[PDB]
Motif scaffolding. Structure first.
Motif, PDB file in Angstrom:
ATOM      1  N   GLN A  14      55.632  -4.878 -10.440  1.00 54.42           N
ATOM      2  CA  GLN A  14      55.285  -3.596 -10.248  1.00 54.42           C
ATOM      3  C   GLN A  14      55.241  -2.740 -11.601  1.00 54.42           C
ATOM      4  OE1 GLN A  14      56.782  -1.494  -6.522  1.00 54.42           O
ATOM      5  NE2 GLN A  14      58.474  -3.166  -6.703  1.00 54.42           N
ATOM      6  N   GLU A  15      56.122  -2.735 -12.367  1.00 55.91           N
ATOM      7  CA  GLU A  15      55.975  -2.373 -13.653  1.00 55.91           C
ATOM      8  C   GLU A  15      54.751  -2.704 -14.456  1.00 55.91           C
ATOM      9  OE1 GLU A  15      59.601  -3.496 -15.328  1.00 55.91           O
ATOM     10  OE2 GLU A  15      60.855  -2.614 -13.889  1.00 55.91           O
ATOM     11  N   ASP A  18      52.109  -0.686 -12.227  1.00 58.41           N
ATOM     12  CA  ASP A  18      52.077   0.822 -12.664  1.00 58.41           C
ATOM     13  C   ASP A  18      51.647   0.932 -13.967  1.00 58.41           C
ATOM     14  OD1 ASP A  18      53.356   1.197 -10.241  1.00 58.41           O
ATOM     15  OD2 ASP A  18      55.428   1.116 -10.821  1.00 58.41           O
ATOM     16  N   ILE A  21      48.544   1.258 -12.660  1.00 59.92           N
ATOM     17  CA  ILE A  21      48.360   2.744 -12.061  1.00 59.92           C
ATOM     18  C   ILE A  21      48.057   3.673 -13.061  1.00 59.92           C
ATOM     19  CG2 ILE A  21      50.082   4.343 -11.393  1.00 59.92           C
ATOM     20  CD1 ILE A  21      50.560   3.117  -9.103  1.00 59.92           C
ATOM     21  N   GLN A  22      48.397   3.601 -14.306  1.00 65.85           N
ATOM     22  CA  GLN A  22      48.236   4.737 -15.394  1.00 65.85           C
ATOM     23  C   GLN A  22      46.862   4.720 -15.808  1.00 65.85           C
ATOM     24  OE1 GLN A  22      48.567   4.490 -18.746  1.00 65.85           O
ATOM     25  NE2 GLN A  22      49.146   2.293 -18.746  1.00 65.85           N
ATOM     26  N   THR A  27      45.832   3.814  -8.208  1.00 66.65           N
ATOM     27  CA  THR A  27      47.140   4.170  -7.099  1.00 66.65           C
ATOM     28  C   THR A  27      47.238   2.958  -6.151  1.00 66.65           C
ATOM     29  OG1 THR A  27      45.848   6.101  -6.888  1.00 66.65           O
ATOM     30  CG2 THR A  27      48.310   6.525  -6.779  1.00 66.65           C
TER      31      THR A  27
END
Lengths: 97, 122, 177, 59
Positions: A14-15, A18, A21-22, A27
């Motif tokens: 997930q990290e 993420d 994500i950035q 999203t």
């Protein structure tokens, strides 16, 4: 079961999604679809990736059964698997059916 | 025999999601970033070595103090157990646990079992 | 012989509507499985007691071995429920049933008792010997077995358990082997 | 304090998203059964996610 996202393996993943994500995977969409793939993959690997058995003892503090999932918390408990001897005074156990 | 399983699972998962990433419109470079990001966090933690890392009636207030601390239950620096249950049994305050497919982290080390049987008094 | 109390089932109305799911997640030592039971089962270690807390602000404290112990345990359960934050009241802590056990210390002939007292006593062996002597004047159900101990159940107050045992003592003394 | 306005708004958007989830609940005797079947892998999964957040915060 999106159960195993709380695993070293799942969080490191997930990290990653993420950091996307950035920068790229804004999203959900891509990221969500990947997680879905992960669920199927981790579940499948667990049930048929082999395993080894044993027997042991403990002392208790709390419990929670909801959604067919048991969550315990034992105190001053030592568990031994095969040769390995181990101690513990606070262990949390989450168990799916 | 544990780092091995993890490599095994990471490889299988990475290989098995490649097409999904591609179908979603993704460069294989991103896949490699995933693997790197993933492998790296374990190395940083240093919990074990990895190949990648090496690279009155009205008021109830009359009562004063019984109900123990709820916050004691959570530390998250403790030992967490992910497993499945076959049968959980209780008689009076005697509990018996019949567990399977579990991954344990006790005292810092990682262990696995296909079956676990336990006993505890509440 | 003096009978010793073994169980006090006592009930108290907390006075307000309680959300059961919230109580289960935060309270320690709590299990609330909807499919099996319709209540939260909460257990405390200091005075042994298992209590079913109902959703309408009710609590049945079982497992206490004396009257004062049961009132105190119900007060403790109420304090634990309050600290969560639901409005809490304590009303009508009334004992419902008390079970007491004692041993006459002599062997007893159950078959004989059925012969002279068929009206109040019913006994069927079928792999479970146990004469039930339902007594009307003090309302209590006493289970007298062959070894000797007479358990007494159903007494709403302490005196009834003692009175019934004194009343049944002459009958057993007559049939003493 | 335009941040407080953000809390009122983004949080309000989260509430509408929750309303959308309440609509998903319906689709996800048979129908009634399916709602409980999906609930099994809903709140338990949410609890697991909350534990994952708690462990990350501890880290």
């Amino acid at each position: 079961y999106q159960l195993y996202r709380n695993t070293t393996l799942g969080n490191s993943l997930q990290e990653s999604l993420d950091e996307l994500i950035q920068s790229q995977q804004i999203t959900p969409q891509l990221a969500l679809q990947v997680l879905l793939q992960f669920d199927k993959a981790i579940n499948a690997a667990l049930a048929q990736r082999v395993r080894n058995r044993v027997n042991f003892r403990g002392s208790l503090n709390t419990y929670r059964f909801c959604d067919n999932v048991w969550t315990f918390v034992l105190n001053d408990v030592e568990f031994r698997e095969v040769t390995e001897l181990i101690k513990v005074d606070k262990v949390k156990i989450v168990a799916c059916d | 025999t544990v780092p091995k399983l993890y490599r095994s699972v990471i490889e299988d998962v990475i290989n098995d999601v490649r097409d999904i990433f591609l179908d979603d419109g993704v460069d294989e470079q991103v896949l490699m970033e995933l693997k790197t990001l993933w492998e790296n966090k374990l190395m940083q933690s240093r919990a074990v070595d990895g190949f990648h890392s090496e690279e009155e009636e009205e008021p109830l207030n009359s009562e004063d103090d019984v109900s123990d601390e709820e916050g004691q239950e959570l530390f998250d620096t403790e030992n967490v157990v992910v497993c499945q249950y076959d049968k959980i049994h209780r008689s009076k305050n005697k509990w018996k646990f019949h567990l399977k497919d579990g991954i344990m982290n006790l005292n810092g080390r990682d262990y696995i079992f296909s079956k676990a049987i336990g006993d505890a008094e509440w | 012989i003096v009978p010793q109390l073994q169980n006090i089932v006592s009930t108290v109305n907390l006075g307000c509507k309680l959300d059961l799911k919230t109580i289960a997640l935060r309270a320690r030592n709590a299990e609330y499985n909807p499919k099996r039971f319709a209540a939260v089962i909460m257990r405390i270690r200091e005075p042994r007691t298992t209590a079913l807390i109902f959703s309408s602000g009710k609590m049945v404290c079982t497992g206490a071995k004396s009257e004062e112990q049961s009132r105190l345990a119900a007060r403790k359960y109420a304090r634990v429920v309050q600290k969560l934050g639901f409005p809490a009241k304590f009303l009508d802590f009334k004992i419902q049933n008390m079970v007491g056990s004692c041993d006459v210390k002599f062997p007893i002939r159950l078959e004989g008792l059925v012969l002279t007292h068929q009206q109040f006593s019913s006994y069927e062996p079928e792999l479970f010997p146990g004469l039930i002597y339902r007594m009307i004047k003090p309302r209590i159900v006493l289970l007298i077995f062959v070894s000797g101990k007479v358990v007494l159940t159903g007494a709403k107050v302490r005196a009834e358990i003692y009175e019934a045992f004194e009343n049944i003592y002459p009958i057993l003394k007559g049939f003493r082997k | 304090a335009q941040l407080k306005f953000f809390e009122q708004l983004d949080q309000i958007e989260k509430q509408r998203k929750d309303e959308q989830e309440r609509e998903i609940l319906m689709r996800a005797q048979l129908r009634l059964k399916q709602k409980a079947k999906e609930m099994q892998q809903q709140e338990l999964a949410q609890m697991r996610q909350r534990d994952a957040n708690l462990t990350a915060l501890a880290a």
